[PDB]
Design a protein around this ligand. Structure first.
Ligand SMILES: [Mg+2]
Ligand SMILES: [Mg+2]
Ligand SMILES: [Mg+2]
Ligand SMILES: [Mg+2]
Ligand SMILES: [Mg+2]
Ligand SMILES: [Mg+2]
Ligand SMILES: [Mg+2]
Ligand SMILES: [Mg+2]
Ligand SMILES: [Mg+2]
Ligand SMILES: [Mg+2]
Ligand SMILES: [Mg+2]
Ligand SMILES: [Mg+2]
Ligand SMILES: [Mg+2]
Ligand SMILES: [Mg+2]
Ligand SMILES: [Mg+2]
Ligand SMILES: [Mg+2]
Ligand SMILES: [Mg+2]
Lengths: 152, 100, 83, 99, 127, 208
RNA sequence: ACCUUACCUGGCCUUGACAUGCUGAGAACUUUCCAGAGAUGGAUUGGUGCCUUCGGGAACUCAGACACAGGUGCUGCAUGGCUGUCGUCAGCUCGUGUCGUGAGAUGUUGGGUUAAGUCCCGUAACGAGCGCAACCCUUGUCCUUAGUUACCAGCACCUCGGGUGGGCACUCUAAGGAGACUGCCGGUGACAAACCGGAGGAAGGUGGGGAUGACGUCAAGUCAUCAUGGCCCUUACGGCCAGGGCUACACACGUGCUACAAUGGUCGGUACAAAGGGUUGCCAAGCCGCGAGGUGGAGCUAAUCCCAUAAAACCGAUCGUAGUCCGGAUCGCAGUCUGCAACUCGACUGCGUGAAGUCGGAAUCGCUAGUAAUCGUGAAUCAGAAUGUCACGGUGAAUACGUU
C-alpha cells in the first residue's frame, strides 16, 4: 500500500504448549476455518513425532524449520528488454513464513494414509534434511550463486 | 397494459368470485375419503361443467393504476415503478429509506 | 403424474362422442382438440384426428396405448434437420 | 384488570399517546405499572428504480411498527372509555382487553 | 455477598455470578467439559482467572444466550473479567495490560446490493 | 449523475407524510388506493384553485381531508354550497364518511408547487421561459427564501432539439439534512410536446 | 402448463371488451337443458322492481345510429419523467476589482499538511455558490424509565417444567441521555497547520458499515410501466376463444451449482445461532405410511401458538485410496402433491442402473479483518415451480519490504 498505515494484528492462543510458532503453523495448516480439525491433525502428528523421537517434539520442530528456512531468495526484475533475476537476503520475519508454507505444502504431497503422518514424516526429514522441502530450499539457495553476478 | 386486457382480467375477477362456493364443496367432497366413487365421478363431471375462467390460477394480479403484469408488491397494490413515485412524495404511510 | 385419487381424465364431449361411436364399428375418424385427455381400452381400434397446431393428425388407437395421453402421438415441432 | 395495547408506525405519536393515557389513568385514581415496549416489526422492501434493465440499481425501503403494552391495576374509573377520540387521534391503534 | 458481571461477544451474552468457592464452574447447570467439547474454550475461559492466581479462590455460576461456542467462550471470559475486577479493584491495570476487559467490537458485516458476499463481487469479463 | 428525491430523503427527519393513519394486512391496499384516487381526483377537479397540499387522516372508520390553497374564496363560496357537494362525492368514493377543512396559505410565491404550476401554465401560453424564470425567482426572493433554483427542460420555444436551462440564486444546499428544501415538479403540454419544470426552495435551518 | 402472451394455426365479431352524447324495449338477479374445442346461439319455474309532482324519474340489461372508442403500431436522433457511467474521483463555477487590443487570465498559482479546493502561512486580489466535512440510520460502553407474553439473583412450594407463589437483582426488549472532541503529557514542526509516541478509556485519531452521487460527458438506455409532439390501420395493425411456442438444437460465449475425495464418505447419540412470515393464513398432538404424504383438529390477529429438528463443529465404529463404501449425470419401473388439466412443459418420493471427472493450456477473476474461505437459515414474486435476487447468523485465516 502507498499509505503504509496498515498495522498488524497479534495472535497468540496456544492451547496447552504455550508457544508462538505453533499457533502460526496452526493457521498455516488450517483450511476453510477448520481450526479444531487442524488441532487434532497436528497434535496426532506431534504425538507420532514424540513416540518416534526420543526428545521433546518442539525443539525437533524448530530444528526442522531451521533446515528449511532459505537464507537468500531470488526475485525476477526486468532490466527493460531482458528477463533477469536478482538474489536478495530474505527479511528475517519472512523466513519463518516461507519455512512454514514450504513444509505444509510439501507434507501435503506425500500420498500416504493421512497428512498427520505426512507432517510427521517431513518434520523428521527436515530435522536433518533428507526430505523434499529441503531439496527445494537448497535449489532456491543455489539459484542465488547461479545469479550472483547482478546482486549489487 | 392495454385497457381491453385490464377489462378482461377484471371480468375474470368477477367470474372467479361469483361462484366461490361450488368449487369449495366439490373439491371438499372429492378430497373426502369416505364419499364413494360415484360422488368422486359426479363431482369431477360437475367441476368440468363450469367454464375454465373460474379458478384462482387463471387470475394474475396487476397494478391498480397501470396494470403491469410484472413487478408486483401485494403488501401495497401498486407496481414497481409507481410505488417509488408515491413513496417519494410521502403518500405511503410509514415508508422511509432504510440503511441499518 | 395425476395421483391415484383420480384414475381417468377425458374431455366430456370426447367421452360422449366415443361412447355414442361404439354403437357401430370403426367407420370414421373422430376430430379432437384436447390433447390432455386419457384413453382407456374402450376406444381401441378407433381413429382419432388430434389437433397438432395447424392440422388434425389421425392416429389409430390400439390396446397397447392405455397408459399414454392423446398428445404423445402428435409432434408439434418439426426439426427436419440442420442440413 | 384491563390491558391496553398500542400499535403505531412512528414512535413520536405512540410515546405521546402512552404519556397521555398514563397521566389520565394516574390522575383518575387508577393504579398503573410501567409502559412496556415490544420489539418493533421491520418490513424490508427492495425495488428496481430504472424503468428498464439496470439490475444493480436498487432502492431499499422500511416499514416500522411499534408495539406498546399497559395495564390498569384496581379499575375504579372507566373515564378512558370516553376518551378514545382523544387518546387515538391520527395514526395510533388502541386495543383494550379483559374489561 | 457475591459479585456479578456481564460479558458480550459475537452476538453472545453471558451473565456471571462469583461467590466464595474453589471453581466448580457451571454452564447452565452443566459440567464445564460436558459443555466445551474438545476445544480450547476451557483454557480461554480460565485465562483471566489463572492470570491472577485465583482459580481455587472462587466459585462461578454462569448462563449464556446466543452465538456460537467461540463467541460464548469469549463472552464468559469478558464477563468473569468484569466480575473479578469488581472484587479486587487494584488489578484493573493488570487486565488492561493483558487486554481482557476490552470488548471485541468485531461483528458480521451485512450483505450489499450487487455483491454475492459482503465484499465478494462477480467475475467481470471485460469483453 | 442522478439526485435522490429531496422530499423523500428527508421523510421523518424534517418532512411529514401526507397520509397519516394505521391499517393491517387487509385494508392497507384499499386505503392506499382510495388515497391515490382521491388525491388525483381532487387535483384534477380543483385545478382552477391553487391547491398544493392534500393532507389525509383516518380515525376509526372515518376520514379527514385538509386542503392547503392560496385561494380559499372559490371553494368557500357564499357560505358553503361547494364543499358539501365535495363531501358527498368523496363519501361516494371513500366508503367511510369524510371531513373537509380548507386551510389558506399565505405567501403563495414561497410554495414550490404553486411556482411550478404558474411557470408551466405560462409556458403553455407561448411565453419566453427566461422571463418567467426571472420573474418567479425575483418574486420569491422579495420575501424570505434564503435560496431558490428553477429548472426547465424540453424543446424550449419551438426548436426541434431539447435542452435544459436552470437559474439559481441564494444557496440551496441539497446535501444537508437539516434544511427543509421544498421541492416540486410539473409538466406543461404545448403544441411541440412536454416541458418539465422543477422548483427547489430553501427556507432555513432546523436546529435542535 | 392454461392465463400471463404482446407470436403462429384455425374458428368467431364490427360504434366493439371500455368512456360520453340520441332513440326503443324492459331489472339486475335467479333460470340447473341442448349444440358447439369456445367465443356463441337456442329453451329456462320464479320478480316486475326503488322513490313517487303518482304524472313521472334515477340505476342496470339488450337492439339500432353517428360523432367515436381502440393500437405492447413506427420515430428514445422531436420529448417529459426515471436510470447507468466516468466516480463518491475532488473538483466545478460566479460577483466585484485588476492585467491583456482580444480569445482570455488572476482568484483556483506557491511552501507545508490532510481521506478531501481540509487546514495554516504567504500572496492584485477581495468575497460567494455547488461539491468535501457535519446534521440521518445502524454497530460497540454506561445511566434513567419500563417488567407482560420477556427475565429468574434471593425466599418458599414443587410433580422438579420459572412449573408454581413471588421479585424488580440480572439478561433482554425500546425511548430518552452521557461518552471520543488531538481532549492531557513528550518530541518533531517555519515556535503555524500537522505528524510520531504515551497515559487513561469499551472505543483514538473522519471507531466499524450504510444512506447521501457537484458542474457535465456518452444524440448512453427506456415510446413496452407511465405521459406526450408527430406519422400510421379503422371488416383491422382493433377485439374473443381453442390448441402450439417462448423450455427447439450440427455449434460458440457469459454468469453459476456439484464434484474429481482420507483436513474425506457412511453409522450412533450428541451442544451452541441470528433474522423473518402467518385469520381468503400458519397449520401442532395423535394415528396410518421406509418414504414424499394423508386424516385429525389444537393454539394463535402472535416476545404468548405454528413455520422449526440449524449446519459445519465434537466422541466412538467402519471404509484404506480404489474411478472406490468418491462422484452423481443419464435412464427403466412404481408413487406423493397443487392445479380444470403435469405429453409438448412442474416440483419432489421409493427401488434399480450407474456416466464424465485423477484439480484443469494460452489466458483471466475476487478479496486487506468477522475480510477471504467454508456451513446453514429466512423473505419477496407465488396455486405449484430458485443452483437466481435480497437478507441473517456459525467457524474463521495468509499476506503487504515497496511504487520501477
Ligand atoms: Mg394505453
Ligand atoms: Mg399465477
Ligand atoms: Mg447485522
Ligand atoms: Mg457469512
Ligand atoms: Mg473472461
Ligand atoms: Mg438519449
Ligand atoms: Mg431521456
Ligand atoms: Mg482592459
Ligand atoms: Mg482559470
Ligand atoms: Mg481548477
Ligand atoms: Mg471547501
Ligand atoms: Mg457527506
Ligand atoms: Mg493511544
Ligand atoms: Mg442512441
Ligand atoms: Mg391462448
Ligand atoms: Mg424466454
Ligand atoms: Mg456415495
Amino acid at each position: 500500500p502507498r499509505r503504509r498505515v496498515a498495522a498488524k494484528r497479534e495472535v497468540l492462543a496456544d492451547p496447552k504448549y504455550g508457544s508462538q510458532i505453533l499457533a502460526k503453523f496452526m493457521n498455516h495448516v488450517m483450511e476453510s476455518g477448520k481450526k479444531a480439525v487442524a488441532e487434532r491433525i497436528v497434535y496426532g502428528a506431534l504425538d507420532k513425532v514424540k513416540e518416534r523421537g526420543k526428545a521433546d517434539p518442539l525443539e525437533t520442530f524448530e530444528k526442522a524449520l531451521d533446515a528449511i528456512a532459505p537464507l537468500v531468495e531470488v526475485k525476477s526484475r526486468r532490466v527493460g528488454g531482458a528477463t533477469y533475476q536478482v538474489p536478495v537476503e530474505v527479511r528475517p520475519s519472512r523466513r519463518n513464513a516461507l519455512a512454514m508454507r514450504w513444509l505444509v505444502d510439501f507434507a501435503r504431497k506425500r500420498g500416504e494414509k493421512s497428512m498427520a503422518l505426512r507432517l510427521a514424516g517431513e518434520l523428521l526429514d527436515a530435522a536433518e534434511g533428507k526430505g523434499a522441502a529441503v531439496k527445494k530450499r537448497e535449489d532456491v539457495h543455489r539459484m542465488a550463486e547461479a545469479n550472483k553476478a547482478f546482486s549489487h | 397494459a392495454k385497457e381491453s386486457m385490464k377489462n378482461r382480467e377484471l371480468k375474470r375477477q368477477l367470474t372467479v368470485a361469483k361462484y366461490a362456493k361450488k368449487r369449495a364443496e366439490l373439491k371438499a367432497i372429492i378430497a373426502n375419503p369416505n364419499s364413494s366413487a360415484e360422488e368422486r365421478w359426479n363431482a369431477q363431471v360437475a367441476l368440468q361443467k363450469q367454464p375454465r375462467d373460474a379458478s384462482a390460477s387463471r387470475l394474475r394480479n396487476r397494478c391498480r393504476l397501470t396494470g403491469r403484469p410484472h413487478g408486483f408488491y401485494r403488501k401495497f397494490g401498486l407496481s414497481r415503478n409507481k410505488l417509488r413515485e408515491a413513496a417519494m412524495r410521502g403518500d405511503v404511510p410509514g415508508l422511509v429509506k432504510a440503511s441499518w | 403424474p395425476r395421483s391415484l385419487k383420480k384414475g381417468p381424465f377425458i374431455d366430456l364431449h370426447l367421452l360422449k362422442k366415443v361412447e355414442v361411436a361404439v354403437e357401430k364399428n370403426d367407420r370414421k375418424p373422430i376430430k379432437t382438440w384436447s390433447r390432455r385427455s386419457m384413453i382407456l381400452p374402450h376406444m381401441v381400434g378407433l381413429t382419432i384426428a388430434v389437433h397438432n397446431g395447424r392440422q388434425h393428425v389421425p392416429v389409430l388407437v390400439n390396446e397397447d396405448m392405455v397408459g399414454h395421453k392423446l398428445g404423445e402421438f402428435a409432434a408439434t415441432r418439426t426439426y427436419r434437420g440442420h442440413a | 384488570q384491563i390491558r391496553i395495547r398500542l400499535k403505531a408506525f412512528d414512535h413520536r405519536l405512540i410515546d405521546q399517546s402512552t404519556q397521555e393515557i398514563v397521566e389520565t389513568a394516574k390522575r383518575t385514581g387508577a393504579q398503573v405499572r410501567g409502559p412496556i415496549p415490544l420489539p418493533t416489526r421491520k418490513e424490508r422492501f427492495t425495488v428496481l428504480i430504472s424503468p428498464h434493465v439496470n439490475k444493480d440499481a436498487r432502492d431499499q425501503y422500511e416499514i416500522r411498527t411499534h408495539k406498546r403494552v399497559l395495564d390498569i391495576v384496581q379499575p375504579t374509573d372507566k373515564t378512558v372509555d370516553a376518551l378514545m377520540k382523544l387518546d387515538l387521534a391520527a395514526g395510533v391503534e388502541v386495543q383494550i382487553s379483559l374489561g | 455477598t457475591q459479585n456479578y458481571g456481564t460479558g458480550r461477544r459475537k452476538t453472545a451474552t453471558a451473565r456471571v455470578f462469583l461467590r466464595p468457592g474453589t471453581g466448580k464452574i457451571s454452564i447452565n447447570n452443566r459440567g464445564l467439559d460436558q459443555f466445551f467439547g474438545r476445544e480450547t474454550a476451557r483454557m480461554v475461559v480460565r485465562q483471566p482467572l489463572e492470570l491472577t492466581e485465583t482459580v481455587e479462590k472462587f466459585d462461578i455460576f454462569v448462563t449464556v444466550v446466543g452465538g456460537g461456542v467461540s463467541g460464548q467462550a469469549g463472552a464468559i471470559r469478558h464477563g468473569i473479567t468484569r466480575a473479578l475486577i469488581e472484587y479486587d479493584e487494584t488489578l484493573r491495570s493488570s487486565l488492561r495490560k493483558a487486554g481482557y476487559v476490552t470488548r471485541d467490537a468485531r461483528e458480521v458485516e451485512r450483505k450489499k446490493v450487487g455483491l454475492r458476499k459482503a465484499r465478494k463481487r462477480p467475475q467481470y469479463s471485460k469483453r | 449523475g442522478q439526485k435522490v428525491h429531496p422530499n423523500g430523503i428527508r421523510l421523518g427527519i424534517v418532512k411529514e407524510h401526507t397520509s397519516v393513519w394505521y391499517a393491517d394486512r387487509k385494508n392497507y391496499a384499499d386505503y392506499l388506493f382510495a388515497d391515490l384516487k382521491v388525491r388525483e381526483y381532487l387535483q384534477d377537479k380543483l385545478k382552477s384553485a391553487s391547491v398544493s397540499r392534500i393532507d389525509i387522516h383516518r380515525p376509526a372508520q372515518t376520514a379527514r381531508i385538509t386542503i392547503h390553497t392560496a385561494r380559499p374564496g372559490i371553494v368557500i363560496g357564499k357560505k358553503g354550497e361547494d364543499v358539501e357537494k365535495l363531501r358527498q362525492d368523496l363519501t361516494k368514493q371513500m366508503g367511510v364518511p369524510v371531513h373537509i377543512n380548507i386551510e389558506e396559505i399565505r405567501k403563495p410565491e414561497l410554495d414550490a408547487m404553486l411556482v411550478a404550476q404558474s411557470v408551466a401554465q405560462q409556458l403553455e401560453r407561448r411565453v419566453m421561459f427566461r422571463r418567467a424564470m426571472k420573474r418567479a425567482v425575483q418574486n420569491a426572493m422579495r420575501i424570505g427564501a434564503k435560496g431558490i433554483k428553477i429548472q426547465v427542460s424540453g424543446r424550449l420555444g419551438g426548436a426541434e432539439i431539447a435542452r435544459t436551462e436552470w437559474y439559481r440564486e441564494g444557496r440551496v444546499p441539497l446535501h444537508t439534512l437539516r434544511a427543509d428544501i421544498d421541492y416540486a415538479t410539473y409538466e406543461a403540454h404545448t403544441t411541440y410536446g412536454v416541458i418539465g419544470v422543477k422548483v427547489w426552495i430553501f427556507k432555513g435551518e432546523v436546529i435542535g
